Every structure is written in structure tokens, then in C-alpha cells.
Amino acid sequence: LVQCILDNTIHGRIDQVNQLLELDHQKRGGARYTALDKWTNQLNSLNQAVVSKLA
């Protein structure tokens, strides 16, 4: 399992304490949150430029 996971062949992780393998039935349409993160980052940089234009 370790070799497959490190090779990106199996999408999951191993719970060594309980001897479990939790798969990756995840990664839904969460591209909205990443889009909002880019919007916030651009606004943070743009705001600083406007104030520091001349003085």
C-alpha cells in the first residue's frame, strides 16, 4: 500500500493505529473556494498599491 500511494496509484491513506485504509471519496467541486482565495489575494495587493500611489 505504501508503494502504491507514493506512486499516486492508490488514492488513500493508512491509519496505522487501527490498521485501516481510508480511501479518497473526496475532492468535490471545491474550486469556488480556491477562486475566492485568488480574489482575496489580488485585492490585498491591489489595495496596497492604491494607497501608496504617490503619498
Partner 1 sequence: VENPSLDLEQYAASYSGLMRIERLQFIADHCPTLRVEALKMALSFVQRTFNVDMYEEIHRKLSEATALDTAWVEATRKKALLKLEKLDTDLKNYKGNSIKESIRRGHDDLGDHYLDCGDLSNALKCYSRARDYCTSAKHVINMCLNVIKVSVYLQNWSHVLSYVSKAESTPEIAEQRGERDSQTQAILTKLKCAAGLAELAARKYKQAAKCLLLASFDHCDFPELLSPSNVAIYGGLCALATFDRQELQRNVISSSSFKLFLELEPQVRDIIFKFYESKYASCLKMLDEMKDNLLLDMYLAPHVRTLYTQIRNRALIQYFSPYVSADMHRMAAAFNTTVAALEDELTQLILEGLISARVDSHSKILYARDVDQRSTTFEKSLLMGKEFQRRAKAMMLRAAVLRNQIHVK
Which sign, positive or negative, has the C-alpha torsion 28, 29, 34, 40?
Answer: negative
Residue 9 interacts with partner 1 (CB under 8 A): yes or no: no
Q: Is 16 in the site for partner 1 (CB under 8 A)?
A: yes
11 lines the binding site for partner 1 (CB under 8 A): no
From 25, 23, 27, select the one nearest 13 (Cα to Cα).
23
Handedness of CA 25, 31, 33, 38 (dihedral sign): positive
Give the nearest distance from C-beta 36 to partner 1 in angstroms.
Answer: 5
What is the contact surface with partner 1 in residues (CB under 8 A)? 1-3, 5-7, 13-18, 22, 30, 33-34, 36-37, 40, 43-44, 47-48, 51, 55
